[PDB]
Write a protein that binds this ligand. Structure first.
Ligand SMILES: CNC[C@H](O)c1ccc(O)c(O)c1
Lengths: 256, 211, 60, 338
């Protein structure tokens, strides 16, 4: 069904471009969002804007065409490029998470170290880490070397997932003792959709992928179902991480 | 050249903005016989005070001397971290000088209403000090509290009728969800630092949407 | 108490001893002034773009 | 006797009012009824000056028609260049609570002041380096709401202690004091002849002062709330005020009455600033509704709008040759609307 397999993916490209670009313009067209910590939303938006325009189309061609790949030298510049973009959108989510953890525990001590001198250091550090893992009739198959499949899964998902649950349950302790203003339900549904969305989207792929490395077997129907779940998370990132803040909503109306 | 002027000067403005926007700024209020005099010592026009405590810069601005209308300069002070409001408890049997039949107690409850329930401080917390409890017990063992409060029927003591007065000052608050009043009984430069880190924490915790 | 009241009456007594002209003569002079000078105000009558320093001209 | 003082005052109040009524012949809606409408003015922001990092409270042009000055809560007073958007100077203020600026008619120094109760005079040509602080004018007991240069060697200042004072710089002493208001004085405006000036107070009244006598000539009432702004007509025979009542008015010196009122039914906020064009045919007024309307002074009809600011417009000025309009606001942005 070329009608569904192209129209559905095209919807993904539109939402990812619409959400991320809208965030970049809003940050650059207001003084309310002039904080130095709001350059994380920008850099994360640039990591998710390149994956939509470059990775999804070529990957989409492989599935619907069905047979082969038009080329034999761009694969190393595509199969590696795809890994880097995906790896740099998850890795920017730990930098957002860790930023708001020091602001809540070390608040007065963290009034400094907020200068763009440090913020720029993190973003340049985020993109270089993504670079390391990305670039260490015939078809395209994601790498199936046993020493790279399990090496890149730990360093791209399972390690960044161990720093968003520890942070977001320590922030659960702070906001329950501190407020005590009958607002218990407010800060428990916000910390449940931040983590739940990130895990349901990405966990099945990095879980089944690792099983097919140690010497198990997984149906190829499910694996392709799980493969495209990771692309979905790129579109949702501007939603979860900018909707509960009043400042972003006001600036959005400034342009729309 | 009017092109090598701005670049060599605008490099001296942003170099001063972030360099001077890290301090904590506060606003003193009260009345003439409140205690503003005897709290600044422990810690014309506008006066400025600067002090430090465990590596945090405090900038306290006193606006007592300005005897002109308040609505014409109060809007200059929005965006401060908190207000610091001074009261004296030994003024429940003292009458004003210019006008009789009005206490200096009911006259401070009229300046707490104005600043607590104000349009420019709808999200700013108030740090309320209650001074002169030393002399309060002396007067309350001789002059009954009924003279000021005809509805404070209760046994007089040092800390039974001196806690009935906190209620009358925290009931005035009408923004019972957007702000909080931190009342004290003048560990006086600690109470402000304890209550300021709790205002900054709930600000960052609101950037995440958890409040 | 009484010294100020003496000054207040003196000020009004000197304020109410000025010669006033009618409003019709007063409105005519305002209207006549703007008609005469209407030609030299760029904002009302836009200037040619050759000489409008902020629009397009020599910025000097 | 107190009653004798009141009885004499009460009688004089009625006599003044009836003399004003005897001068009422016809409103401006009749004499100027058959005049040609201005049309629909459409200005557009040419330049935009960035660099203040806080609210903007005041500004002032230069007689050059090319240089201006501004003040901000950032504790910074910047002299720009409007042609090239250049910072000619920048001055560190000893106090952050500035409310006014100034620019000498000679153009060799500026004036500043705020809630300090003092007025500082900085020198714009030291012949050896940067700007210094070459005077200090203290003697007010309330905040400074306004100041204006009367000459290269005089300055007149306004303050919230209910008093205007005429100084004489290089000595730092009040030559004259102008008393009579019963409320905080918010603004003052010199005459083109530089021999009279007007002021506006929270008493909801305005006065006309003879500069070289210390005398008050006459007083104007009619507003229902505080008066925030005031300006003379270009020839100096009328002036306009703007109040918190959401209304502007026009007053004649030689008729002693209100001539025109500039108010709509969809305007509920207060006017923060007023100014007249070079010919005097347009009146520009900044508001709390983030905007700046344009009025037809001879017909009392809106004739434009300058909507380009995010917060309320606090300051507003026009050039001597009449080419540009500048507006400032609490956004930290000042715009030129040639
Ligand atoms: C569904 N597209 C993700 C891509 O297959 C991918 C992303 C990150 C990695 O570490 C990886 O090995 C592969």
């Amino acid at each position: 069904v070329t009608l569904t397999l192209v129209c559905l993916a095209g919807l993904l490209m539109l939402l990812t471009v619409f959400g991320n670009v809208l965030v970049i313009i809003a940050v650059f067209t207001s003084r309310a969002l002039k904080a130095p910590q709001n350059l994380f939303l920008v850099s994360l938006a640039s990591a998710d804007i390149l994956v939509a325009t470059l990775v999804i189309p070529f990957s989409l061609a492989n599935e619907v065409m069905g047979y082969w790949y038009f080329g034999k030298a761009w694969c190393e510049i595509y199969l590696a490029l795809d890994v880097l973009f995906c790896t740099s959108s998850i890795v920017h989510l730990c930098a957002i998470s860790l930023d708001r953890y020091w602001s809540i525990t070390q608040a007065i001590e963290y009034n400094l170290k907020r200068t763009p001198r440090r913020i720029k250091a993190i973003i340049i550090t985020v993109w270089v880490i993504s670079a390391v893992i990305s670039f260490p009739e015939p078809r395209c198959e994601i790498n199936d070397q046993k020493w790279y499949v399990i090496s890149s899964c730990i360093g791209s998902f399972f390690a960044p997932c161990l720093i968003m649950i520890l942070v977001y349950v320590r922030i659960y302790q702070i906001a329950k003792r501190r407020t005590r203003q009958n607002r218990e339900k407010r800060f428990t549904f916000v910390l449940a959709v931040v983590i739940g969305v990130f895990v349901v989207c990405w966990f099945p792929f990095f879980f089944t992928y690792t099983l097919t490395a140690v010497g198990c077997s997984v149906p190829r129907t499910l694996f392709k179902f799980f493969f495209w779940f990771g692309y979905c998370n790129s579109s949702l990132n501007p939603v979860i991480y900018t909707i509960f803040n009043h400042d972003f909503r006001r600036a959005f109306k400034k342009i729309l | 050249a009017a092109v090598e002027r701005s670049k060599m000067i605008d490099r001296n403005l942003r170099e001063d903005g972030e360099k001077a926007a890290r301090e904590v700024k506060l606003l003193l209020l009260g009345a003439g016989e409140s205690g503003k005099s005897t709290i600044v010592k422990q810690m014309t026009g506008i006066v400025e005070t600067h002090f430090t405590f465990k590596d945090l810069h405090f900038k306290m601005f006193d606006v007592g001397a300005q005897r002109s209308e308040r609505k014409k300069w109060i809007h200059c002070f929005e965006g401060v971290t908190a207000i610091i409001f001074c009261v004296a408890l030994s003024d429940y049997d003292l009458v004003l000088a210019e006008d009789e039949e009005m206490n200096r107690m009911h006259e401070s409850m009229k300046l707490f209403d104005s600043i607590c329930n104000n349009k420019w401080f709808t999200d700013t917390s108030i740090i309320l000090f209650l001074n002169k409890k030393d002399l309060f017990e002396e007067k309350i063992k001789k002059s009954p509290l009924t003279i000021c409060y005809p509805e404070y029927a209760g046994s007089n003591t040092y800390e039974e009728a001196a806690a009935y007065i906190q209620c009358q000052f925290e009931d005035l608050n009408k923004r019972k969800d957007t702000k909080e009043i931190y009342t004290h009984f003048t560990k006086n430069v600690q109470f402000v630092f304890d209550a300021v880190t709790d205002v900054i924490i709930k600000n960052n915790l609101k950037d995440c949407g958890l409040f | 108490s009484i010294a100020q009241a003496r000054k207040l009456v003196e000020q009004l007594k000197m304020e109410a001893n000025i010669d006033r002209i009618k409003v019709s003569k007063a409105a005519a002079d305002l209207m006549a002034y703007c008609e005469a000078h209407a030609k030299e105000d760029p904002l009302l009558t836009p200037v040619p773009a050759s000489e409008n320093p902020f629009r397009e001209k020599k910025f000097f | 006797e107190l009653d004798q003082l009141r009885q004499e005052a009460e009688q004089l109040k009625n006599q003044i009012r009836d003399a004003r009524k005897a001068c009422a012949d016809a409103t401006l809606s009749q004499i100027t009824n058959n005049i040609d409408p201005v049309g629909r003015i459409q200005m557009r922001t040419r330049r935009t000056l960035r660099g203040h990092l806080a609210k903007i409270y005041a500004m002032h042009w230069g007689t050059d028609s090319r240089l201006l000055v501004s003040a901000s809560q950032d504790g910074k007073l910047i002299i720009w260049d409007s042609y090239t958007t250049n910072k000619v100077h920048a001055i560190p203020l000893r106090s952050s609570w500035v409310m006014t600026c100034a620019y000498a008619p000679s153009g060799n120094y500026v004036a500043c002041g705020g809630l300090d109760n003092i007025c500082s005079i900085y020198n714009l040509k030291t012949r050896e380096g940067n700007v210094r602080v070459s005077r200090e004018l203290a003697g007010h007991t309330g905040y400074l709401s306004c100041c204006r240069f009367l000459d290269d060697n005089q300055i007149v200042t306004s303050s919230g202690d209910t008093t205007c004072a005429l100084w004489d710089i290089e000595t730092g002493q009040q030559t004259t004091t102008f008393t009579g208001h019963t409320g905080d004085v918010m603004s003052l405006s010199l005459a083109p002849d530089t021999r009279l000036f007007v002021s506006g107070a929270c008493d909801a009244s305005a006065k006309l002062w003879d500069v070289r006598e210390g005398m008050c000539r006459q007083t104007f009432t009619g507003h229902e709330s505080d008066i925030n702004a005031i300006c003379f007509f270009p020839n100096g025979n009328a002036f306009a005020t703007g109040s918190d009542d959401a209304t502007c008015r026009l007053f004649d010196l030689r008729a002693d009455q209100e001539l025109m009122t500039y108010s709509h039914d969809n305007i509920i906020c207060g006017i923060t600033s007023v100014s007249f064009s070079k010919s005097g045919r347009l009146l520009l007024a900044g508001y709390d509704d983030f905007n700046c309307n344009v009025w037809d002074a001879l017909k009392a009809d809106r004739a434009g709008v300058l909507a380009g600011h995010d917060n309320r417009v606090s300051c507003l000025g026009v050039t001597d040759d009449g080419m540009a309009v500048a507006t400032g606001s609490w956004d930290s942005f000042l715009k030129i609307w040639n």
